[PDB]
Design a protein around this nucleic acid. Structure first.
Lengths: 78, 100, 461, 146, 49, 431
RNA sequence: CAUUGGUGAGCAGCGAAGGAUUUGGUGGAUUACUAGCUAAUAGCAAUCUAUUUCAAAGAAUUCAAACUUGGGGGAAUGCCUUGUUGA
């Protein structure tokens, strides 16, 4: 979600952002067409329940005790 | 009429049905080899279809007083203020100043 | 002069140099192909994005440019080059030591004209060849047939005829046989440019004295003599939409539009290109659409649109003024200072001797901007100084940027030549900031710097 | 070889102006369903756009921006009531763009049609089932498993 | 890439649904020129509807 | 773009085709004479019964409408509509309507004309389709209530947006809002096409030309501050004054004289441009009432421009054109008038061309100098040319009589320029 | 007396042939630029038709599918499943 300070101006139409438009119905399959997204699933238990894209954050950083490095647990992983 | 006649433009026998751009120039369907004078007459009419013919190429031809003297001068003059004279009388209502 | 550490990439920040560019139709879209020195670039029409450059640079300057549907024909010092996609697909060599000046292509007959009054004809070997490669013949214009070859044009619906315009007369060449078939009467003025017309057998000739002589090549007689007062004529084109508009481009930075139906003027665009760099070198309409693309020696390339008429019923009389559109450009001068705006190697700030400051992009060549010298309003409520007739800032000689704290305040300090204050610039807003930093000891600034935190700027008197 | 560029010159100005060339770039491939009388037009954007278009005159009865992927929409009985097909459910609208019902069945509607003399709304989508619906009484008349 | 195409029932135009919007190509002889006023009226007022 | 802005383009195209009875009600209620209820409840033939009586009354007044009985007001012109006919013939219908409105722009103070144009409003939809030529024709009658009626019917083009607050207004549009309409740069070019079509069809009258002069003078006066705007306004009102001078009427020549005076007084011009203003005025001047106005215009045009060579010799083409079109006795009797306008720069430029070209009639300048009072430097330039005349011409004694006046008043001036060119004592020896 | 409230009259100072607001329309960016169209190893772009038809290839859930149901209670007429007459 939060990778950009400046969002693009060709994505807001006269109503609604273009990437916020629920485009799951255009898929050809069934299981990803199924939406079980709960309304209040902010940091839930799955990602199909999210209804948005995941937000970027780092939440725990420690220095390495040996080799001049530091590891940060991110949304993208570690 | 004609200010020049190309002598080596009549003996030429171009084909027409070999390229799709020239395949719209056929009038019958049993003609493929057409001489140049018919071909350059056909290609003139096809060019008249693509680009039209505006009226100024035909209606106008340049070839005790006069009435179009103001129209002639306005065509040949592009700046109209009497400022190139340096008239030694300053123009009223406007002032050209420079600050140093 | 070879290197084992660095190797050239491209020349960032150039659009045009002043050579008359070419444009080529390609289905519905158009591509504007220009040249910059020893290379050449291909610009799209509807967005002015750079599409292709030459993969390998030419050994010398590109003198003549022409473009068919796909194959762009570049003409440098001795040889002409047939390129597609920027790739050197074929090199066509001219077997003479003189220099190529003009390059016409019609049909299977490429028409290369050297400077010493010789026209080379190049023939496609196969009728389905994509470019001419074999050498047909070498037409020669003597000193009794005319002057030097001003241009080579091929008029519409002429079977194997080449129209040659000299400084004094117009000639025709049956290139299949290599024979002169018609000579025009002598023109007392020196012809400077030539252009075909949507009407048949009509070529437009622009002279150094401001006369547009419109020569009907069938009757061998002129038709319309359009007079322009004492201006050197450089460009000629017609609006091929159907409305009768003739665009004549002076070298003094003026663009004059004529309504040939009503025999009247339309608009005189002033200063679309600078005087000293050549002015309006090449300016032509896109074929069938009211968008005219102009370019000159000022390293810029502008587009102008004729809007549809405000009157619902009259139309042709009340015609709209031409209106500015897409434009890509660079400095008219060589650039003095260059810095880098970020650690991503994205943006390059260049301040030139053209009294400006540009933020080029190494990633996308259409992302470049000219950073605005529009002063902010003073916080005190007192009106700022400077001239009412606005001019640009003096030439910038020292520069410093900190990318740490960007967009919340000013992050560029630039130092101008012979000025007793440095100026602030905001990189994110792309605009001159609201603070000037005086030396407070009566001194020009010769060096400036930033802290890495970005809060502090240092000024050297 | 006769093209639309020269048809419009030789065709009278009534149907020349009726040759409506729109431009709605920002959404998906639009699905068209005219009314049974040629007076109203219905567009179905694949991303979000449904407009209860009055066509011969320039009025627009209802403009709706439905963020689910709309598939097929049709007027059912008049120009007033029309029904669109969303990602999972078929909705039915009025002339003002208001919702009227959320149809609990027709749980997939890729192709939605209407037949007028029975007041019968038909639906058959990615589900194999074809569901007949009565827009006059609201009773789902039949549910055929194909 | 066209999505669907549908004729106006009582004029002669086909409405082709493409990705960038709506076009109406003119045809000479698609629609019938004699409509029935007791079934389908292109010119129908409010009280008649 | 969006959707609804494209729909208004379709709605503006199809604002004349009737689709429902509501659309027919809102289009047939457009009425020049009847009210809204009577317009909605009357048939096309009932309008045409009054229309045929209206044009028969107009054919009695001027017989130019006898053509329009058989092309626009025939009984076959009822069933046809503009929105059933293709583009190749609606252009012929457009300029036929424009030819009628130009031939009926003068006739508007008569109720037969309003009844005749009422059916043209209803049957051919001219209050929506071609609104410009209708509004230009009646523009000079803006005080009259028939213009207030026409604004209440019409739909305004984008160019007449200054009258957007005067539609369905109980107060008529004023003089100030008409100049604000004419201040638009593009509208002046459209009225140029209207005026050029007005002159070409030879139906130009007093009231529309009085009003056009009353707005052309003001639009220069309102743009007298901006010198850039009057540079942009020069090729319109000079081309109008070129076409207005080319007319053979008694009215367009004086109306072109009014434009040419105030424009040059508010904007000094190049000498060759005002030299072309002489030849266009002097070419087709044959009206007796316009000869006095033309002499005062050339008088005012010469004193507008200032510079070196302001009062120099005219070309021989212009001088012999002025000699034929204006006798020397005629300009002397013009100077006899005790109003005596400022003809100082013209007279000293006239007599230098007299001394150069004819070289025979010097009794006129004896009567010219006694009549007019001239300034200092203009007298110096006259004497300098007459001194040059004394060198080359075989000197008759009337030249001595002319310098006898020159020593009778301001003898230091003739003595000083004689010191500049020659000897003071050599004048008596040479004359 | 404070006004950390509004409305107006001025001054000091700022001050290069005007300066403040406020707003419509358009253009360029807002991810890193290999060109348009088509039936595409090529053609067109002023067209694919009096060259675009034949041939070749091509058929399992042997006669397969709502993985998409708010909950409670039923289900007469429906529908589904399993047993009951005649080709």
């Amino acid at each position: 979600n939060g990778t950009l300070e400046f969002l693009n101006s060709k994505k807001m139409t006269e109503a609604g952002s273009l990437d916020l438009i629920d485009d799951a119905g255009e898929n050809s399959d069934l299981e990803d067409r199924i939406d079980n997204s709960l309304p209040g699933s902010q940091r839930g238990g799955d990602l199909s329940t999210r209804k948005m894209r995941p937000e970027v954050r780092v939440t725990s950083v420690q220095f390495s005790p040996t080799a001049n490095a530091f590891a940060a647990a991110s949304t993208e992983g570690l | 009429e004609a200010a020049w006649i190309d002598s080596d433009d009549e003996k030429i026998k171009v084909p027409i049905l070999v390229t799709n751009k020239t395949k719209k120039l056929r009038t019958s369907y049993n003609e493929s080899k057409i001489n140049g004078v018919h071909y350059i007459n056909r290609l003139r009419s096809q060019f008249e279809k693509i680009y039209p013919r505006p009226k100024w190429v035909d209606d106008e031809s340049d070839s005790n007083g006069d009435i179009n003297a103001l129209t002639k001068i306005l065509s040949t003059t592009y700046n109209y203020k009497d400022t190139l004279s340096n008239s030694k009388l300053l123009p009223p209502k406007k002032l050209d100043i420079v600050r140093l | 002069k070879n290197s084992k550490i660095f190797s050239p990439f491209r020349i960032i920040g150039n659009v045009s140099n002043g050579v008359p560019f070419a444009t080529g139709t390609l289905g519905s879209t158009f591509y504007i192909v220009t040249c910059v020195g020893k290379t050449f670039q291909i610009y799209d029409a509807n967005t002015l994005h750079l599409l292709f450059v030459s993969e390998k640079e030419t050994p010398s300057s590109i003198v003549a440019l022409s473009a068919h549907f796909h194959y762009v024909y570049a003409a440098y010092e001795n040889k002409v080059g047939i390129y597609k996609r920027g790739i050197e697909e074929h090199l066509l060599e001219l077997e003479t030591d003189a220099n190529v000046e003009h390059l016409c292509i019609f049909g299977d007959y490429l028409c290369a004209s050297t400077d010493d009054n010789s026209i080379f004809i190049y023939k496609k070997s196969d009728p389905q060849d994509k470019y001419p490669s074999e050498f047909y013949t070498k037409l020669t214009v003597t000193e009794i047939q005319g002057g030097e070859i001003v241009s080579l044009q091929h008029l519409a619906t002429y079977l194997n005829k080449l129209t040659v315009v000299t400084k004094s007369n117009v000639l025709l060449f049956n290139v299949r046989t290599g024979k002169l078939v018609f000579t025009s009467n002598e023109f007392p003025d020196q012809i400077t440019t030539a252009e075909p017309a949507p009407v048949l057998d009509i070529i437009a000739l622009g002279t150094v004295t401001g006369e547009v002589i419109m020569f009907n090549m069938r009757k061998g007689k002129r038709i319309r003599t359009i007079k322009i007062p004492q201006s050197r004529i450089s460009s000629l084109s017609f609006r091929t939409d159907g409305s009768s508009h003739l665009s004549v481009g002076t070298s003094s930075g003026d663009l004059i539009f004529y309504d040939l139906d009503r025999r009247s003027r339309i608009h005189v665009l002033k200063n679309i290109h600078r005087e000293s760099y050549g002015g309006v070198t090449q300016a032509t309409f896109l074929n069938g659409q009211p968008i005219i693309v102009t370019s000159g020696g000022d390293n810029s390339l502008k587009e102008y649109v004729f809007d549809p008429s405000l009157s619902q019923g009259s139309g042709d009389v009340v015609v709209q003024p031409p209106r500015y559109l897409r434009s890509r450009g660079g400095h008219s001068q060589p650039p003095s200072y260059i810095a880098f705006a970020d650690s991503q190697s994205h943006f390059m700030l260049s301040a030139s001797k053209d009294r400006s400051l540009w933020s080029f992009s190494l990633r996308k060549d259409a992302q470049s901007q000219e950073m605005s010298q529009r002063l902010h309003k003073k916080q005190d409520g007192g009106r700022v100084g400077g001239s009412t007739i606005k001019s640009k800032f003096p030439e910038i000689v020292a520069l410093a940027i900190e990318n740490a704290r960007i967009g919340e305040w000013e992050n560029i300090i630039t130092a101008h030549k012979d000025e007793k204050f440095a100026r602030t610039w905001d990189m994110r807003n792309k605009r001159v900031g609201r603070w000037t930093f005086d030396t407070t000891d009566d001194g020009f600034v010769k060096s400036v710097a930033m802290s890495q935190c970005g809060n502090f700027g240092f000024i050297g008197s | 070889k006769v093209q639309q560029s020269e048809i419009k010159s030789s065709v009278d100005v009534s149907t020349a102006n009726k040759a409506l060339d729109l431009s709605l770039k920002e959404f998906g491939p639009y699905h068209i369903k005219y009314a049974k009388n040629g007076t109203h037009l219905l567009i179905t954007g694949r991303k979000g756009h449904v407009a209860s278009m009055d066509w011969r005159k320039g009025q627009l009865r209802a403009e709706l921006f439905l963020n689910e992927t709309c598939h097929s929409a049709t007027y059912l009985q008049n120009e007033q009531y029309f029904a669109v097909a969303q990602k999972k459910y078929t909705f039915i609208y009025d002339h003002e763009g208001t919702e009227l019902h959320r149809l609990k069945q027709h749980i997939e509607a890729r192709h939605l049609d209407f037949l007028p003399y029975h007041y019968l709304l038909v639906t058959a989508g990615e589900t194999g089932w074809l569901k007949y619906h009565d827009v006059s009484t609201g009773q789902l008349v039949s549910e055929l498993r194909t | 890439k066209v999505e669907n195409l549908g004729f106006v029932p009582f004029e002669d135009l086909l409405g082709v649904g493409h990705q960038t919007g709506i076009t109406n190509l003119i045809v000479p002889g698609a629609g019938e020129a004699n409509y029935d006023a007791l079934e389908l009226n292109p010119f129908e007022t409010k009280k008649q509807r | 773009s969006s959707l609804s802005d494209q729909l208004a383009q379709v709605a503006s195209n199809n604002a004349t085709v009737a689709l429902d009875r509501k659309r027919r009600q809102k289009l047939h209620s457009a009425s020049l004479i009847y009210n809204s209820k009577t317009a909605a409840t009357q048939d096309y033939d009932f309008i045409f019964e009054n229309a045929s009586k209206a044009l028969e009354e107009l054919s009695q007044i001027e017989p130019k409408f006898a053509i329009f009985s058989r092309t626009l007001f025939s009984e076959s012109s009822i069933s046809l509509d503009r929105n059933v006919q293709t583009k190749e013939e609606i252009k012929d219908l457009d300029n036929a309507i424009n030819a009628y409105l130009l031939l009926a722009s003068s006739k508007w103070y008569l109720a037969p004309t309003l009844h005749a144009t009422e059916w043209l409003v209803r049957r051919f939809q001219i209050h929506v389709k071609n609104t410009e030529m209708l509004l230009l024709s009646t523009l000079n009658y803006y005080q009259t209530p028939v213009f207030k009626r026409i604004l209440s019917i019409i739909k305004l083009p984008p160019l007449f947006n200054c009258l957007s607050n005067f539609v369905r207004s109980e107060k008529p549009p004023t003089a100030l809002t008409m100049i604000k309409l004419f201040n638009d740069m593009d509208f002046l070019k459209l009225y140029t096409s209207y005026l050029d079509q007005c002159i070409k069809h030879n139906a130009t009258y007093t009231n529309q030309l009085l009003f056009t002069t009353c707005c052309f003078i003001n639009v220069v006066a309102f743009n007298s501050n901006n010198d850039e705007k009057l540079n942009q306004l020069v090729p319109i009102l000079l081309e109008i004054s070129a076409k207005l001078l080319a007319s053979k009427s008694k009215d367009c020549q004086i109306a072109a004289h009014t434009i040419l005076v105030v424009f040059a007084t508010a904007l000094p011009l190049k000498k060759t441009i005002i030299l072309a203003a002489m030849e266009t005025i002097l070419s087709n001047l044959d009206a007796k009432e316009a000869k006095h106005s033309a002499l005062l215009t050339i008088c005012k045009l010469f004193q507008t421009l200032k510079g070196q060579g302001n009062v120099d010799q005219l070309p021989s083409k212009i001088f012999k054109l002025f000699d034929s079109k204006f006798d020397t006795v005629s300009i002397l009797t013009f100077l006899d008038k005790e109003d005596k306008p400022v003809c100082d720069k013209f007279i000293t430029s006239y007599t230098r061309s007299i001394a150069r070209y004819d070289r025979s009639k010097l009794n006129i300048i004896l009567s010219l100098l006694k009549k007019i009072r001239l300034e200092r430097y203009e007298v110096r330039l006259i004497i300098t040319d007459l001194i040059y005349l004394s060198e080359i011409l075989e000197d008759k004694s009337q030249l001595v009589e002319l310098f006898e006046y020159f020593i009778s008043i301001n003898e230091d001036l003739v003595l000083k320029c004689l010191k500049s060119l020659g000897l003071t004592g050599x004048x008596x020896x040479x004359x």
